[PDB]
Design an enzyme around this catalytic site. Structure first.
Site, mmCIF file in Angstrom:
data_model
loop_
_atom_site.group_PDB
_atom_site.id
_atom_site.type_symbol
_atom_site.label_atom_id
_atom_site.label_comp_id
_atom_site.label_asym_id
_atom_site.label_seq_id
_atom_site.Cartn_x
_atom_site.Cartn_y
_atom_site.Cartn_z
ATOM 1 N NE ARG A 156 33.102 43.111 46.589
ATOM 2 C CZ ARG A 156 32.715 43.866 47.492
ATOM 3 N NH1 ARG A 156 31.880 43.643 48.530
ATOM 4 N NH2 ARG A 156 33.168 45.160 47.606
ATOM 5 C CB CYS A 174 41.030 43.769 35.120
ATOM 6 S SG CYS A 174 42.144 45.156 34.525
ATOM 7 C CB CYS A 201 37.766 50.614 35.629
ATOM 8 S SG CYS A 201 38.452 50.528 37.448
ATOM 9 C CE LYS A 205 37.915 40.142 46.303
ATOM 10 N NZ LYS A 205 38.829 40.840 44.885
ATOM 11 C CB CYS A 236 45.099 50.348 38.367
ATOM 12 S SG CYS A 236 44.160 49.644 39.714
ATOM 13 N NE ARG A 260 31.696 42.451 40.726
ATOM 14 C CZ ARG A 260 32.579 43.583 41.525
ATOM 15 N NH1 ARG A 260 32.544 43.306 42.832
ATOM 16 N NH2 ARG A 260 33.162 44.493 40.944
ATOM 17 C CE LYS A 290 37.717 44.640 47.239
ATOM 18 N NZ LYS A 290 37.264 45.370 45.850
ATOM 19 C CB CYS A 349 40.442 43.671 39.087
ATOM 20 S SG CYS A 349 40.340 44.828 40.365
HETATM 21 C C1 SRM Z 1 35.198 42.699 36.954
HETATM 22 C C2 SRM Z 1 36.514 42.361 37.871
HETATM 23 C C3 SRM Z 1 37.827 42.101 37.094
HETATM 24 C C4 SRM Z 1 37.410 41.355 35.754
HETATM 25 O O1 SRM Z 1 37.746 41.512 34.463
HETATM 26 O O2 SRM Z 1 36.866 40.120 36.059
HETATM 27 C C5 SRM Z 1 36.675 43.466 38.708
HETATM 28 C C6 SRM Z 1 36.453 44.927 38.430
HETATM 29 C C7 SRM Z 1 36.584 45.843 39.583
HETATM 30 N N1 SRM Z 1 37.382 45.801 40.705
HETATM 31 FE FE1 SRM Z 1 38.091 44.155 41.376
HETATM 32 N N2 SRM Z 1 37.245 43.060 40.029
HETATM 33 C C8 SRM Z 1 37.396 41.632 39.906
HETATM 34 C C9 SRM Z 1 38.027 40.872 40.516
HETATM 35 C C10 SRM Z 1 38.925 41.387 41.733
HETATM 36 C C11 SRM Z 1 40.031 40.544 42.143
HETATM 37 C C12 SRM Z 1 40.291 38.973 41.622
HETATM 38 C C13 SRM Z 1 39.690 38.179 42.277
HETATM 39 O O3 SRM Z 1 38.845 38.642 43.426
HETATM 40 O O4 SRM Z 1 39.714 36.745 42.150
HETATM 41 C C14 SRM Z 1 40.879 41.136 43.112
HETATM 42 C C15 SRM Z 1 42.364 40.829 43.498
HETATM 43 C C16 SRM Z 1 42.546 40.078 44.541
HETATM 44 C C17 SRM Z 1 42.396 40.761 45.827
HETATM 45 O O5 SRM Z 1 41.204 41.118 46.171
HETATM 46 O O6 SRM Z 1 43.287 40.949 46.659
HETATM 47 C C18 SRM Z 1 40.243 42.423 43.030
HETATM 48 C C19 SRM Z 1 40.591 43.662 43.766
HETATM 49 C C20 SRM Z 1 39.811 45.021 43.912
HETATM 50 C C21 SRM Z 1 40.294 46.212 44.625
HETATM 51 C C22 SRM Z 1 41.656 46.231 45.652
HETATM 52 C C23 SRM Z 1 40.882 45.502 46.768
HETATM 53 C C24 SRM Z 1 42.065 45.647 47.929
HETATM 54 O O7 SRM Z 1 42.098 44.815 48.775
HETATM 55 O O8 SRM Z 1 42.721 46.636 48.136
HETATM 56 C C25 SRM Z 1 39.450 47.152 44.199
HETATM 57 C C26 SRM Z 1 39.744 48.620 44.539
HETATM 58 C C27 SRM Z 1 39.110 48.915 45.971
HETATM 59 O O9 SRM Z 1 38.550 47.939 46.721
HETATM 60 O O10 SRM Z 1 39.301 49.818 46.504
HETATM 61 C C28 SRM Z 1 38.612 46.446 43.218
HETATM 62 C C29 SRM Z 1 37.628 47.613 42.467
HETATM 63 C C30 SRM Z 1 37.086 46.870 41.369
HETATM 64 C C31 SRM Z 1 36.216 48.046 40.471
HETATM 65 C C32 SRM Z 1 34.812 47.823 41.372
HETATM 66 C C33 SRM Z 1 36.709 49.256 40.582
HETATM 67 C C34 SRM Z 1 36.078 50.543 41.339
HETATM 68 O O11 SRM Z 1 36.270 50.303 42.662
HETATM 69 O O12 SRM Z 1 35.382 51.292 40.992
HETATM 70 C C35 SRM Z 1 36.219 47.211 39.297
HETATM 71 C C36 SRM Z 1 34.669 47.698 38.312
HETATM 72 C C37 SRM Z 1 35.402 47.553 36.965
HETATM 73 C C38 SRM Z 1 34.403 47.808 35.821
HETATM 74 O O13 SRM Z 1 33.971 48.656 35.054
HETATM 75 O O14 SRM Z 1 33.562 46.580 35.825
HETATM 76 N N3 SRM Z 1 38.738 45.175 42.653
HETATM 77 N N4 SRM Z 1 39.378 42.514 42.074
HETATM 78 C C39 SRM Z 1 36.395 41.317 38.721
HETATM 79 C C40 SRM Z 1 35.064 41.120 39.199
HETATM 80 C C41 SRM Z 1 34.820 40.073 40.302
HETATM 81 C C42 SRM Z 1 33.495 39.853 41.041
HETATM 82 O O15 SRM Z 1 32.553 39.661 40.484
HETATM 83 O O16 SRM Z 1 33.242 40.173 42.191
HETATM 84 S S1 SF4 Z 2 42.708 46.079 38.168
HETATM 85 FE FE1 SF4 Z 2 42.388 48.595 38.203
HETATM 86 S S2 SF4 Z 2 41.917 48.888 36.427
HETATM 87 FE FE2 SF4 Z 2 41.525 46.843 36.424
HETATM 88 S S3 SF4 Z 2 39.451 46.704 37.103
HETATM 89 FE FE3 SF4 Z 2 40.462 46.531 38.924
HETATM 90 S S4 SF4 Z 2 40.553 48.529 39.352
HETATM 91 FE FE4 SF4 Z 2 39.812 48.735 37.306
#
Ligand code: SRM
Ligand code: SF4
Ligand SMILES: [K+]
Length: 462
Positions: A71, A326, A332, A109, A371, A2, A107, A375
Site C-alpha cells: 500500500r 473511516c 464500503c 504497509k 467494522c 485509489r 497486504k 481502517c
Molecule cells: C480509505 C481508508 C479509510 C479512511 O477513511 O481513510 C480505507 C478504506 C477501506 N479499506 Fe482499509 N482503508 C484505509 C486504511 C486502512 C488502515 C489504516 C492504515 O493503513 O493506516 C487499515 C488498518 C491497519 C492494518 O492494515 O492492519 C486498513 C485495513 C484494511 C483491511 C483489513 C486488512 C487485514 O489485515 O485484515 C481491509 C479488508 C481487507 O483487506 O480484506 C480494508 C479494506 C478497505 C476497503 C477497500 C473495503 C473493501 O475491502 O472493500 C475500504 C474502502 C472503503 C471505501 O469505500 O472507500 N482495509 N485500512 C484508508 C485508505 C488508505 C489507503 O489509501 O490505502
Molecule cells: S473499517 Fe470496515 S467499514 Fe471502515 S472503511 Fe475499513 S472496511 Fe469499510
C-alpha cells in the site's frame, strides 16, 4: 479507486487533474483524502474506467494493482525540523519504487517517521523506518516491524499488535533491509489461513529474535542498538507554520478528509483556486488533512484569503482536530456501523461533554471504525469505537496520545446514547482527578478504569 502517492506529496498540476475528474466523472463528485496520505474517488461512472487510468497517467501518477499487496508508503508530512522532510520523503519514494512489482500472503504497509511526530501511526504498519539525524541530515533508521490493527469480532485468534524494535541501520542499508523484511514475511507467512498471514502473526509465531536474525542474514548486515527517539503526539499542525527558508506551510483541517462544495463552504472550489496560484505542492496528511506546502511569505495573505473565504479555515475544537473516522457507509461493502457520517454529530456531543467538564481546550485521540478491519485506526486511539451493527459499537479505552498502546475493550455492542453516558462520567472523573498534563487514555489506566494491554497476542482479549 485509489492512487499511489508516497508521502502524500502531490503537485498542483496533479491536483487540478484529479479535481476535474472528480467533479465530472464520479457519482459523489468528491475528493476523499485517506489516512494513508492519498486520495480516493467514489462512484466512478463505469463509463469512465479507462479514463481514470489515463487521467492519472497524463500527470505522472499510477494506481496500485489492488494482486499487488503493498500500500501507500507514508512519510511524516510536517516535521518540526523542517529541513528533514526532503531527505525523508526521498527515501519514502525510494522504498515505494523498490517494492513495486514476490507475491505476499497479506497486504504490506510501510512508513518513514520523523520524531517526535507519530502522525503516520507507525504501530499500525508492517515495516517502519524511524529517521535518525545528525546535524540536520539523515544518518539512518531505527527499524520497527510487525504492527497491524485488523481483528475479527469474537475471534481471539486475531488481535491488533504494535510494532517491535529490531535495531538501527545506516542509511546505506535501507533498501536491503526493506527487501529482507518483505521476503522473510513472504516466505514465513501462513499458507493455510489468509486471516493469519499478516506479519504480526508471523512475528508472534516464530519470535522477534528469530525473525530479526533472518532479516540480518538476508540483508547482509547486523543491527546496531536502537538509537534514542521519543514521540510527543500524532496530530497535525493546523494553521501556519514556518518551514525552511522564507517558506510557510498552511495545514487545513478537512472534516473526514471529504472535499466537496457544500452550502456556504466551497471547499473543493477553494482548493482549486489555491492550486492555480500556489507556487509549491500539496501534502495529504495521515490525519486526512491537506497542507499547502512551501508558501513564500509574500504569498501568505493571498492563500489565506481563499482558504478563509471557502470555509477551509473554519475554526474547530482541538478535540475535533484529533478525531478520525473511516469511510464506511455508503460506499464500503464491509461496513457494519456508520463512521464518516456518524463522526461530525458525535463530535458535537463530545464537544459539549468537554465544555461541561471545563476541558474544552484539551483533546482525546478519538476514532471510529465502521467494522473491525480497523481502517479508522480505532485500535490505536485513546477512545476507540469499532462498529458491530447498525448504530452499535464496541467501546475501547486506554490507548495513549502517541499511539503506542492498544486500547482494551471496555463496553461491547452499545449505542451512541450509551457511549455518551459513559464518556460523560469518565471525562468528568478525568477533568478533576488527572495529574499535570495527563492524557485521558493514561488516566483510565491509572485510575483502574480499564486494564492496559501489555502483550496483545496474549492479553488483548478478556
Ligand atoms: C480509505 C481508508 C479509510 C479512511 O477513511 O481513510 C480505507 C478504506 C477501506 N479499506 Fe482499509 N482503508 C484505509 C486504511 C486502512 C488502515 C489504516 C492504515 O493503513 O493506516 C487499515 C488498518 C491497519 C492494518 O492494515 O492492519 C486498513 C485495513 C484494511 C483491511 C483489513 C486488512 C487485514 O489485515 O485484515 C481491509 C479488508 C481487507 O483487506 O480484506 C480494508 C479494506 C478497505 C476497503 C477497500 C473495503 C473493501 O475491502 O472493500 C475500504 C474502502 C472503503 C471505501 O469505500 O472507500 N482495509 N485500512 C484508508 C485508505 C488508505 C489507503 O489509501 O490505502
Ligand atoms: S473499517 Fe470496515 S467499514 Fe471502515 S472503511 Fe475499513 S472496511 Fe469499510
Ligand atoms: K481530518
Amino acid at each position: 479507486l485509489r492512487c499511489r502517492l508516497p508521502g502524500g506529496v502531490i503537485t498542483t498540476k496533479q491536483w487540478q487533474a484529479i479535481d476535474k475528474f472528480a467533479g465530472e466523472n464520479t457519482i459523489y463528485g468528491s475528493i476523499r483524502l485517506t489516512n494513508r496520505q492519498t486520495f480516493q474517488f467514489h462512484g466512478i461512472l463505469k463509463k469512465n474506467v479507462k479514463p481514470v487510468h489515463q487521467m492519472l497517467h497524463s500527470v505522472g501518477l499510477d494506481a496500485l494493482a489492488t494482486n499487488d499487496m503493498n500500500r501507500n508508503v507514508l512519510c511524516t508530512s510536517n516535521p518540526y525540523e523542517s529541513q528533514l522532510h526532503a531527505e525523508a520523503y526521498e527515501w519514502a519514494k525510494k522504498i515505494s519504487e523498490h517494492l513495486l512489482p514476490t507475491y505476499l500472503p497479506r497486504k504490506f504497509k510501510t512508513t518513514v517517521v520523523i520524531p517526535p511526530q507519530n502522525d503516520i501511526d507507525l504501530h499500525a504498519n508492517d515495516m517502519n523506518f524511524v529517521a535518525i539525524a545528525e546535524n540536520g541530515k539523515l544518518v539512518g533508521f531505527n527499524l520497527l516491524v510487525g504492527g497491524g490493527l485488523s481483528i475479527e469480532h469474537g475471534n481471539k485468534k486475531t488481535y491488533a499488535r504494535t510494532a517491535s524494535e529490531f535495531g538501527y541501520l545506516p542509511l546505506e542499508h535501507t533498501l536491503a533491509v526493506a527487501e529482507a523484511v518483505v521476503t522473510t514475511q513472504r516466505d514465513w507467512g501462513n499458507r493455510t489461513d489468509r486471516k493469519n498471514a499478516k506479519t504480526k502473526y508471523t512475528l508472534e509465531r516464530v519470535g522477534v529474535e528469530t525473525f530479526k536474525a533472518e532479516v540480518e542474514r538476508r540483508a547482509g548486515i547486523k543491527f546496531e542498538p536502537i538509537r534514542p527517539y521519543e514521540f510527543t503526539g500524532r496530530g497535525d499542525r493546523i494553521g501556519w507554520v514556518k518551514g525552511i527558508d522564507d517558506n510557510w506551510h498552511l495545514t487545513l483541517f478537512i472534516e473526514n478528509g471529504r472535499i466537496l462544495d457544500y452550502p456556504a463552504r466551497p471547499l473543493k472550489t477553494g482548493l482549486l483556486e489555491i492550486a492555480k496560484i500556489h507556487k509549491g505542492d500539496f501534502r495529504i496528511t495521515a490525519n486526512q488533512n491537506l497542507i499547502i506546502a512551501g508558501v513564500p511569505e509574500s504569498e501568505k495573505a493571498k492563500i489565506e484569503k481563499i482558504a478563509k473565504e471557502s470555509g477551509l479555515m473554519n475554526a474547530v475544537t482541538p478535540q475535533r482536530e484529533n478525531s478520525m473516522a473511516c469511510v464506511s457507509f455508503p460506499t464500503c461493502p464491509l461496513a457494519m456501523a456508520e463512521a464518516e457520517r456518524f463522526l461530525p454529530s458525535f463530535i458535537d456531543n463530545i464537544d459539549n461533554l468537554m465544555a461541561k467538564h471545563g476541558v474544552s481546550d484539551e483533546h482525546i485521540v478519538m476514532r471510529v471504525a465502521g467494522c473491525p478491519n480497523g481502517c479508522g485506526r480505532a485500535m490505536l486511539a485513546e477512545v476507540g469505537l469499532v462498529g458491530k451493527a447498525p448504530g452499535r459499537y464496541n467501546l475501547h479505552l486506554g490507548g495513549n496520545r502517541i499511539g503506542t498502546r492498544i486500547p482494551r475493550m471496555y463496553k461491547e455492542n452499545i449505542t451512541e446514547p450509551e457511549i455518551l453516558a459513559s464518556l460523560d462520567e469518565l471525562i468528568g472523573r478525568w477533568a478533576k482527578e488527572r495529574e499535570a498534563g495527563e492524557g485521558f487514555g493514561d488516566f483510565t489506566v491509572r485510575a483502574g478504569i480499564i486494564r492496559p494491554v501489555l502483550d496483545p497476542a496474549r492479553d488483548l482479549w478478556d
